[PDB]
Design a protein around this nucleic acid. Structure first.
Lengths: 205, 201, 117, 205, 199, 107, 117
RNA sequence: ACGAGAACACGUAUGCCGAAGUAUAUAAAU
């Protein structure tokens, strides 16, 4: 039995809007009053895109049943063919380096982007204001992958590597089509935390 | 969830023995008093329950042990109190309690768990106006109400300000929001509004 | 000092508030105060760092500028005793009093938003 | 489920004025505090133009329900229809070459141009100052295209081509009718970041 | 849907001073540090003169509601009726040939004109200064007309052509009264760029 | 408790969640009550060493158990991003009998 | 520091400002400052490049020319020790000091705009 | 030789989906 640790940081290329608190703020940690990326967000977007990668039936879409490989990665355990989840996606915390950097250069953590909208037949503007996490800020993320079957390790890592790439080109949070929240990963790393299983040949771009 | 209501006549010990002092304490007469109480508690309990999703579990003597749907249980309990106050001509009173318990619980453990103020003020006044407002304004899900609950449950003045602002961010008619704010200011009316909204869900 | 917090209801005139004050010209003040509040949250001890103090100085500078740009905001700041309380906070250099000030400002702001055209 | 990446470069013909942040400043970023064109503007402008290009009824002008092919391109998912956007527009950034050349010529990125609003029956020209980005500057942009269906990429790309040309002889930003916002597109490149789709016969000009 | 391009070139005929940046300078293009004509100026001279040639009621002046042809031609939406600008006037810049000729003939780009002030009963000489753009220079401009109705294009274009003549006869920029603002237009070119419209 | 009262921090967070139907792309709001980040819990374990000649083994095992938990979660949604805990300031003392405990170690 | 507020309040004379100084009479100055500022922001290290030192001399040249052109600007800059400050900046060549300068000058502008006709 | 003894309130799903900081108005009268 082994547990495999993946570490790295998330770099916000363009502003991020997780925004679960609902003007229209972003999710914040309550001990530091700083932005967070709840692991539900990352994990769900990864599942969603990686599922869309493989063939999904209309009935499969309605019943949330997905491909066998993605499901084995993420677990359904809903009916019948149960599958215990396998990769636990932790949350993200606003890393220390970026906090110090912004303090030193006196940079806000979060901006209030003002946006507008022209309804038709009236052309009348109705404004809005939306909070966005300042770009270039870095989050720390931690993934813990479990080996329920030794045979399948590189294949599962390759699957989540494709999901990582899909997240980078696409977006998290809201305003994704409107420009918000394209992200990149930096300084990834793997190290076997429990077990006796090597992780050197493993890689995630 | 299920609702369970248990009720007992408060002044039944005195009514059965002392009853009417010194002039009508005939054996036949207390018998007829017993007879009326019996016939009520075994016939009206059948008749009145018609419109409530309730099964009669234990009725008799002075013990009323009823279980059913939470909302239905509360409503019928109100109905039964009013009907009793009619039939007792406001001479005998009942003490009653309602507790909400999760389904499939061992009822042997539920049982051991278990007015006009409640009817007129909470249900009749606050509950209806809150219901109308939430009818008029949609999207106001358990999130919005739950933030309200959080605001009320922490009884501090800054929380009063927070409640004011949150109400401002809604789009409910000014009269509705102002009524909620005024009710929150009064400790009694806040406790009553809290109860009404807890009933709301 | 809470009389200056419920004076906002005392300044509801006809139909403008604080002579037409709107949250559109006060949003900058809220953002600046919140930015310093998060820095105070990161701070662990009571005695404020000097750079934080200079941040307070910049805050008051922004207060004066905003009062200069807009008249209703100027009335708000003066009639609510904003500058004296700011200077007092600077004098006390204590975190806890600063949090108290932020709560006061928040109450002012929120109550103001409650009443708006 | 492949993704086609589009890169290009916005060259500003005349002054450019977003003015999101406001005496009324334009949208200027926070990590570099250099102005950027928030994508939300780009997507909105391109969408409104392309909607105008197809049919548009007053009843259609009511509540922003638009022509179906545009809808598939940008997504509404409003009338209970399943439509997630297949083309996401990101933000634009003040690319390095611009900053370099301007520094080595000592030129500002942003001008303040003063206007005199004349009042009829008053003969008073009131001075209003507008801040607009200097001419000849450039930004870099990335668009992401998603292939939800294979045999529709070409048809959607034809609509994109029309909308891209529409932006070159229109104004993007604020108040263009006073002559500010003209832009152009250069150095278009098309790549498929993720997938097995060919984008060589595919072109945008 | 269709878009109509207009390409043309202005030649300056009398000294010219717009002087937005105001010893009272002129506007300048910062990437070239060279004069421009902020097309806002074109728009304004245009609309003002056109209102003048059409009905301009004193009440209409006070209420800024302009003639319906004017308002539709340039878009106003100040009386509540949604109206989109039907023509955009962009800025304009020096022509490559103009700059090349200036360098070849060593022609200065700007002239400082002294304006002497003489007061009656005192005749006290206090010169003032002002800058003018070199006369005879040419800028390349663009007018972008948008089609919103296939039947209104002809009428709108007719108004634009008459207005171009009015702009030539009048003065553009400031100090029009003293001899600053006379420009001509040359090499007008018409070519629709988007759509299937016949021009 | 004292830190939170001083800093005026609520003890419990209410996280908003959402779920997307596929073939519908509709939004279904969810609410989960989570304990606040950074709070500390004082825990007590009692190990009655019924066999002197095995206790070392047992503690090694208990060690591994603790270790696993260090990189895993408790409670619900642990795959979804909550429940990671940490162990600090562990001290081991003998309280019944006369058995030494100066060499048993748990992180 | 904030010796700026003292200078402006002392210059409230008889309702003239520094003998009639106005903010629109400072515009290019602040503009120039802002330009340097954002450039100053983009840099990382505290050692200021030779080109930025030349731009600091250019800012001083602007100040000297503006003071020579307008007598009121001259009084403002003279009393405010602005040229001393700039010279000291040029001597220091440190980014943090420059940022402090930016804050001080911006405060000056804000306070002056606070008291205007 | 305690109405005891064993028993993770667990397993699935995130804040989405659309909205253009927009609408005219000369750096001006010597």
């Amino acid at each position: 039995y082994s547990k495999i640790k993946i570490s790295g940081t998330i770099e916000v290329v363009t502003g991020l809007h997780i925004g679960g608190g609902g003007d229209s703020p972003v999710v914040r940690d309550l001990q530091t009053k700083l932005p967070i990326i709840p692991g539900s967000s990352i994990k769900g977007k990864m599942r969603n895109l990686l599922a869309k990668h493989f063939g999904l039936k209309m009935k499969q879409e309605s019943h949330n049943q997905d491909d066998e490989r993605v499901l084995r990665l993420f677990g359904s355990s809903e009916k019948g063919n149960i599958q215990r989840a396998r990769l636990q996606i932790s949350d993200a915390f606003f890393s220390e380096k970026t906090k110090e950097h912004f303090a030193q250069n006196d940079i806000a953590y979060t901006e209030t982007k003002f946006e507008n909208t022209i309804n038709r037949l009236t052309a009348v503007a109705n404004p809005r204001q939306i909070e966005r996490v300042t770009r270039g800020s870095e989050f720390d993320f931690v993934f813990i992958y479990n080996v329920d079957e030794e045979s399948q390790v590189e294949d599962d890592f390759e699957n989540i590597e494709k999901a990582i790439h899909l997240l980078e080109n696409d977006y998290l949070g809201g305003g994704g089509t409107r420009g918000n929240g394209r992200i990149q990963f930096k300084d990834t790393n793997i190290e076997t935390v429990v077990g006796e299983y090597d992780s050197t040949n493993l890689k995630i771009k | 969830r299920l609702g369970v209501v248990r009720a007992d006549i408060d002044n039944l010990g005195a009514t059965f023995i002392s009853g009417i002092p010194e002039k009508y304490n005939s054996i036949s007469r207390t018998a007829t008093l017993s007879r009326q109480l019996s016939l009520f508690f075994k016939y009206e309990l059948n008749h009145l329950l018609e419109n409530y999703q309730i099964t009669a579990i234990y009725s008799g003597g002075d013990d009323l042990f009823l279980i059913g749907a939470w909302d239905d249980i509360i409503e019928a309990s109100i109905y039964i109190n009013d009907k009793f106050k009619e039939f007792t001509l406001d001479k005998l009173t009942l003490s009653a309690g309602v507790g909400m318990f999760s389904g499939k619980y061992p009822v042997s453990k539920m049982a051991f768990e278990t007015w006009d103020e409640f009817k007129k003020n909470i249900l009749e006044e606050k509950l209806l106006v809150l219901q109308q407002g939430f009818s008029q304004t949609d999207e106001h899900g358990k999130a919005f109400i739950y933030k309200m609950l959080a605001l009320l449950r922490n009884n501090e003045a800054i929380n009063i300000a927070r409640l004011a602002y949150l109400l401002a961010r809604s789009k409910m008619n000014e009269d509705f929001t102002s009524k909620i704010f005024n009710w929150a200011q009064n400790d009694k009316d806040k406790n009553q509004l809290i109860t009404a909204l807890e009933y709301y869900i | 000092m809470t009389f200056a917090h419920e004076v906002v209801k005392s300044n509801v005139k006809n139909q403008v508030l604080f002579n037409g004050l709107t949250t559109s010209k006060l949003r900058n003040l809220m953002e600046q105060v919140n930015r310093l509040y998060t820095i105070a949250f990161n701070s662990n001890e009571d005695q404020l760092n000097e750079e934080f103090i200079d941040e307070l100085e910049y805050l008051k500078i922004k207060f004066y500028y905003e009062a200069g740009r807009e008249k209703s905001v100027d009335e708000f700041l003066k009639k609510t005793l904003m500058f004296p309380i700011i200077d007092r906070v600077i004098k006390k250099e204590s975190k806890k009093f600063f949090l108290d000030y932020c709560k006061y400002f928040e109450a002012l702001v929120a109550y103001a938003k409650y009443y708006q055209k």
